[PDB]
Design an enzyme around this catalytic site. Structure first.
Site, PDB file in Angstrom:
ATOM      1  N   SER A  49       0.821  -1.199   0.000  1.00 57.69           N
ATOM      2  CA  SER A  49       0.000   0.000   0.000  1.00 57.69           C
ATOM      3  C   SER A  49       0.862   1.260   0.000  1.00 57.69           C
ATOM      4  O   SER A  49       2.080   1.214   0.224  1.00 57.69           O
ATOM      5  CB  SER A  49      -0.859   0.005   1.252  1.00 57.69           C
ATOM      6  OG  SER A  49      -0.025   0.126   2.396  1.00 57.69           O
ATOM      7  N   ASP A  82      -0.747  -1.511  -4.180  1.00 55.49           N
ATOM      8  CA  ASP A  82      -2.096  -1.690  -3.670  1.00 55.49           C
ATOM      9  C   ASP A  82      -2.709  -0.332  -3.362  1.00 55.49           C
ATOM     10  O   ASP A  82      -2.108   0.498  -2.667  1.00 55.49           O
ATOM     11  CB  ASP A  82      -2.057  -2.542  -2.401  1.00 55.49           C
ATOM     12  CG  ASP A  82      -3.437  -2.983  -1.934  1.00 55.49           C
ATOM     13  OD1 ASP A  82      -4.380  -3.019  -2.750  1.00 55.49           O
ATOM     14  OD2 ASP A  82      -3.569  -3.297  -0.733  1.00 55.49           O
ATOM     15  N   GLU A 134     -10.864  -0.471  -9.879  1.00 56.26           N
ATOM     16  CA  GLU A 134     -11.934  -0.918  -9.004  1.00 56.26           C
ATOM     17  C   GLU A 134     -13.254  -0.256  -9.378  1.00 56.26           C
ATOM     18  O   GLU A 134     -13.291   0.907  -9.798  1.00 56.26           O
ATOM     19  CB  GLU A 134     -11.598  -0.616  -7.538  1.00 56.26           C
ATOM     20  CG  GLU A 134     -12.619  -1.183  -6.545  1.00 56.26           C
ATOM     21  CD  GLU A 134     -12.148  -1.135  -5.097  1.00 56.26           C
ATOM     22  OE1 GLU A 134     -11.854  -0.034  -4.591  1.00 56.26           O
ATOM     23  OE2 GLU A 134     -12.080  -2.206  -4.459  1.00 56.26           O
ATOM     24  N   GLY A 198     -10.532  -7.293   0.355  1.00 50.88           N
ATOM     25  CA  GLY A 198     -11.117  -7.609   1.646  1.00 50.88           C
ATOM     26  C   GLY A 198     -11.360  -9.096   1.806  1.00 50.88           C
ATOM     27  O   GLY A 198     -12.405  -9.498   2.296  1.00 50.88           O
ATOM     28  N   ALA A 199     -10.387  -9.910   1.395  1.00 51.06           N
ATOM     29  CA  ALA A 199     -10.583 -11.356   1.294  1.00 51.06           C
ATOM     30  C   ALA A 199      -9.992 -12.154   2.453  1.00 51.06           C
ATOM     31  O   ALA A 199      -9.860 -13.373   2.348  1.00 51.06           O
ATOM     32  CB  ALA A 199      -9.997 -11.868  -0.033  1.00 51.06           C
ATOM     33  N   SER A 200      -9.625 -11.493   3.547  1.00 48.63           N
ATOM     34  CA  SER A 200      -9.100 -12.228   4.696  1.00 48.63           C
ATOM     35  C   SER A 200     -10.210 -13.104   5.283  1.00 48.63           C
ATOM     36  O   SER A 200     -11.386 -12.743   5.237  1.00 48.63           O
ATOM     37  CB  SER A 200      -8.530 -11.280   5.749  1.00 48.63           C
ATOM     38  OG  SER A 200      -7.178 -10.955   5.466  1.00 48.63           O
ATOM     39  N   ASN A 240      -6.753 -10.506  -2.460  1.00 51.53           N
ATOM     40  CA  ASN A 240      -5.997  -9.614  -1.597  1.00 51.53           C
ATOM     41  C   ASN A 240      -6.137 -10.001  -0.131  1.00 51.53           C
ATOM     42  O   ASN A 240      -7.242 -10.074   0.401  1.00 51.53           O
ATOM     43  CB  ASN A 240      -6.445  -8.162  -1.782  1.00 51.53           C
ATOM     44  CG  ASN A 240      -6.082  -7.600  -3.157  1.00 51.53           C
ATOM     45  OD1 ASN A 240      -5.811  -8.339  -4.104  1.00 51.53           O
ATOM     46  ND2 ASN A 240      -6.063  -6.280  -3.260  1.00 51.53           N
ATOM     47  N   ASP A 242      -4.347  -9.422   3.768  1.00 49.97           N
ATOM     48  CA  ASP A 242      -3.490  -8.583   4.598  1.00 49.97           C
ATOM     49  C   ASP A 242      -3.789  -8.841   6.068  1.00 49.97           C
ATOM     50  O   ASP A 242      -2.916  -9.210   6.845  1.00 49.97           O
ATOM     51  CB  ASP A 242      -3.749  -7.107   4.266  1.00 49.97           C
ATOM     52  CG  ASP A 242      -2.750  -6.161   4.935  1.00 49.97           C
ATOM     53  OD1 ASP A 242      -1.971  -6.613   5.794  1.00 49.97           O
ATOM     54  OD2 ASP A 242      -2.738  -4.959   4.588  1.00 49.97           O
TER      55      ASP A 242
HETATM   56 CA   LIG Z   1     -11.928   2.054  -3.668  1.00 47.71          CA
HETATM   57 NA    NA Z   2      -4.930  -4.249  -5.252  1.00 54.45          NA
HETATM   58 ZN   LIG Z   3      -8.873  -2.951  -1.267  1.00 52.05          ZN
END
Ligand SMILES: [Ca+2]
Ligand code: NA
Ligand SMILES: [Zn+2]
Ligand SMILES: [Ca+2]
Ligand code: NA
Ligand SMILES: [Zn+2]
EC number: 4.1.2.13
Lengths: 294, 294
Positions: A49, A82, A134, A198-200, A240, A242
């Site tokens: 990021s 990111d 996005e 947001g895939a955690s 993604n 994190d």
């Molecule tokens: Ca956004």
């Molecule tokens: Na990304």
């Molecule tokens: Zn994101």
């Protein structure tokens, strides 16, 4: 070796699997991610990021990654910006040696998002760098017909369509729910690699480790493993991740601090933290189907 | 820029000041040390033990340092192998790009120490790399006439003479005591740069931060600032410092863990930890007389 993002994701797209995109902010995170990829024979996206880049310095972020790629030359690796927020930020990452950049203008109306995205794509493609954009807002969902036009006009390499996820440990009140039908429509209309933000998952074992070490995760809920698998089935190719890494890592840091108040050897804190992070990554690689794909 | 150890210590020797030699095991430590040197306009030794090199990988240890030297090209920096235990380890470090190496054979009898040290010196000098060796046992004290013959026969660049310190946080059972007359005799007989091992001070403020954060430092005692200054007066030119760095760093990590159980952003832990480490180093550079020597 270090390669363009699209080299990795086009393969994932064609063969229908997901590649984890793992955030890092320092050496310990980076090392654990690469060792996971080495141990599971998995390609990977390593992403930073803007805040992480500020923290490390972009010279160190790219430099460390290049050192790790030289240590593990058989692993296909993309280095990805990111949530780039400006054209200038994306351009800096391109000049520094990133091989993929995300321009996030999803908070803008369609026309402005398309315009900024297209500007980044022209610049990045000229430099041989892949681009993510996005559409939708994690906090309204993606409009598939918008996505269709957006991709067609921007020539963006991969798209992150909003389908119900959100960043952080508190993704759902009540039962987890994602719009897989919307995902499938986007996939059919765009026919490009798609990205899940947001895939955690916040796996039970990771949550337990964090709580056992005195941590507080009241109300936390991640994306169930089953939903991640369904996302990949639906056309998600970049995943993604994190938060899972941070929690696993810091759990071990807290544990060491708790169990020996006289301990101040950094390696005694960060060796177990690396191992927990590495294990989360290895399991996720197997879950998403990138294991043994090198 | 990155330079041979002797370039830095021959100047310190001639002008009568001390240069801190600061251990690192990862990016956070390295960054704070360099920022300290930048902010105090001070040359510095950056050193890595064999354990730290194993932890990072020698490729990353050297690689991160070269990146930092490129970020701060005006700072004279030597990259030093701390407590090399074998010829092969020293040779690996020379090949990897270290600009100074310590061969520690002080646990052997004079003849064997001299033999091994001489062997390392021949290899290192061929590559333009400076060498440190040690005489005495941190726990018997250096024998000045031995030191004289040892330096002459070995052609070592700097010598670490045992004068009363030891590694770690528990240096003295009673009043702090160092043999400064022995130090002065060694200096007079050898006329080369000298090295003080086990030179952490455990400053009051650092101890307080660690204690306040729930740490235990029962019985700990370092070298008083006044003794470090007297050491430099006596001819010490390289001042090895690791424990102070670790305690200051880990104090902040512990504090963050204590004050917010829901915090798992690595940067929230390591930003304050870097700052505390940086401040210890800045104060030490001023104490030893290397500030404003660039
Ligand atoms: Ca956004
Ligand atoms: Na990304
Ligand atoms: Zn994101
Ligand atoms: Ca020794
Ligand atoms: Na040393
Ligand atoms: Zn030592």
């Amino acid at each position: 070796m270090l390669v363009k993002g699209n080299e990795i994701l086009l393969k994932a797209h064609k063969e229908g699997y997901g590649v984890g995109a793992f955030n890092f902010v320092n050496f310990e995170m980076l090392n654990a991610i690469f060792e996971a990829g080495n141990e599971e024979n998995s390609p990977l996206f390593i992403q930073a990021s803007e805040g992480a880049i500020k923290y490390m310095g972009i010279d160190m972020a790219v430099g460390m990654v290049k050192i790790m790629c030289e240590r593990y030359p058989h692993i296909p690796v993309a280095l990805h910006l990111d949530h780039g927020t400006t054209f200038e930020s994306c351009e800096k990452a391109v000049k520094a040696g990133f091989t993929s950049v995300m321009i996030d203008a999803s908070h803008h109306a369609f026309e402005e998002n398309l315009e900024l995205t297209s500007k980044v794509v022209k610049m990045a493609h000229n430099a041989g760098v892949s681009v993510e954009a996005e559409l939708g807002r994690l906090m309204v969902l993606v409009n598939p017909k918008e996505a269709e036009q957006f991709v067609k006009e921007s020539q963006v390499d991969y798209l992150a369509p909003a389908i119900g996820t959100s960043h952080g440990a508190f993704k759902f009140k009540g039962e987890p729910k994602l719009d897989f039908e919307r995902l499938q429509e986007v996939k059919r209309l765009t026919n490009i690699p798609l990205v899940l933000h947001g895939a955690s998952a916040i796996p039970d074992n990771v949550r337990k480790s964090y709580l056992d070490a005195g941590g507080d995760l009241k109300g936390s809920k991640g994306v169930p493993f089953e939903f991640l698998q369904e996302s990949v089935k639906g056309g998600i190719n970049k995943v993604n991740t994190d938060t899972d890494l941070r929690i696993a890592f810091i759990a071990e840091v807290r544990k060491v601090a708790n169990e020996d108040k006289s301990q101040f050897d950094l390696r005694k804190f960060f060796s177990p933290a690396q191992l927990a992070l590495k294990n989360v990554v290895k399991e996720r690689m197997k879950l998403l189907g990138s294991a043994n794909k090198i």
